[PDB]
Each structure stands twice: as structure tokens, then as C-alpha cells.
Design a protein around this ligand. Sequence first.
Ligand SMILES: CCn1nccc1-c1c[nH]c2ncc(-c3ccc(N)c(C(=O)N(C)C)c3)cc12
Length: 266
Amino acid sequence: DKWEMERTDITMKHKLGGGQYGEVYEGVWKKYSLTVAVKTLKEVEEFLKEAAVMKEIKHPNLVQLLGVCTREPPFYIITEFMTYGNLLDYLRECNRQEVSAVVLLYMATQISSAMEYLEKKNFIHRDLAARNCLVGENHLVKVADFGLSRLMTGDTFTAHAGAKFPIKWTAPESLAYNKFSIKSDVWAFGVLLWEIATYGMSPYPGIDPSQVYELLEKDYRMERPEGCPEKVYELMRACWQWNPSDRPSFAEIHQAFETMFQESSI
Ligand SMILES: CCn1nccc1-c1c[nH]c2ncc(-c3ccc(N)c(C(=O)N(C)C)c3)cc12
């Protein structure tokens, strides 16, 4: 197809993000003199499914596929390079006078726009967090999308026996029953909002992940971050409803943040 590329079109450099994303490398697309990101493999069928899924993703706030090398090993998935790295590090290291309250709303609007698209197109993320959001010039935020899965919106997925999750971002139904849906992404988005409001603080600070579920089932939720608007915190708490069906859709969340962003600008 139009996606299939020669492997030699790309010059590979060093592993990006300190290796936290696995075999993902900075690279040069020589023809265009363009810095790109390249995921390689050095499981096969999982990798090639990722390549297949990425071909169908087209949204301003989801990392764009540029091409693939899927004929013979080594296999490549080639995407745009996000110059400022991930949102977690960006928030921690930023100039807060430049990255102000309106910018935080702008970033939340972008992420929710992407998540509304996945909600519309029957995709599930399963690992929404600041570390999996990527930053470009002018506070452009794109959701990392290698591991997106096909799942009709409303349907559920059961994780494998002995699967380990990032507990502090993980919905109660996922922790207890390994159940994932678009509504568990909504929960994770709530935790992501908390990350944004605190400029990249660790969720449930000082609380060991092994004790988080027990707090959640006793009705504990993180308190409102300093400087966070009441309206934004009420959205967080709505994302953290125990019952998945009680949580808002990403369509409703995006509409709320778009309104808040527009009013903050005016
Ligand atoms: C498809 C989405 N995805 N899933 C995993 C990785 C990517 C990704 C795509 N394009 C990317 N472009 C950049 C980065 C990235 C992230 C963190 C970093 N510290 C760095 C970095 O070292 N510098 C030089 C800024 C680079 C990650 C990705």
C-alpha cells in the first residue's frame, strides 16, 4: 500500500525517551531531511497489528503514522517526531508563566478531542497518562498511539491472568476484574487531568500502589489540586465514579473543556 517503505530510507539514531517506550528510536528520513520516530523489533504478530491499526488513525491530536516496513525483518513503524518529548517531563520542567492556566485547559481540550475520536471510531487506549502524551511546538499535545486496540464503544476487554497495570491510573473494575472499556480510559483521563493540574505530580503522593484500591472502595478520591478550578475538579471526580456507566463520555468532556478554554481566552 501507500504506507510501505524501504527500510534504508531511514537512518537510525539512538533510542528515544531514555528507553521507556521500548525499542523506539530517533531517526532521519533522508529524502525529507526530517527527524522521525521509529519503533522496531530486535512479539512479531502484536507489532504487525500495531502497524495495521496505526494506518486507520487520522486525528490532529493523535501521533501520525508516516510509513511502515512490514515485508521482512527488521520491521519498522515510522511516525512523526514530537520535539518536546512527553507531557509529564514537559509539565515538570516548564516555565509556568508561559504554561499558564489557559494552556493547561488547551492541553486538556486537545487530549479529550483525541479521546472523543477513539470513542467515535471504536478504539480503546488502555494506558492514558501524561507519560503517554507527547508535546510539539506551541503546546501541541498528541496522544501516543502504538498500542491502540479495536473494541466497539460500550464493549469490554478482559486482560490476561497475571497482568500488571499502572495502578494509580487504573479503574477499579480493571484492578479487581481485569475489565477494560472506554469508561476505564475515562477514569485514566481523570488521573491525567490531576497530573496536568499539578504540573506532573505523582498521583496519590506517598501512597503505595498496593493500598490504592482499598482507598477507592472506601470512597477516597484525590483532593482538588492547588489553583485548580472547581469546574475542572468536578470533571475529575465524575471520571472517578465507581460505576463505569456513571462516568461521562469523552464527547461530553471535550465539549466542557472546549467551552472552558474558549471562555478563558475571552
Ligand atoms: C507513537 C507514539 N509513541 N509511543 C511511544 C513513543 C512514541 C513517539 C512517537 N513520536 C515520538 N516523538 C518523540 C518521543 C519522545 C518522548 C520522550 C522523550 N524524552 C523523547 C526524547 O528523547 N527527546 C529528544 C525529546 C522523545 C516519543 C514519540
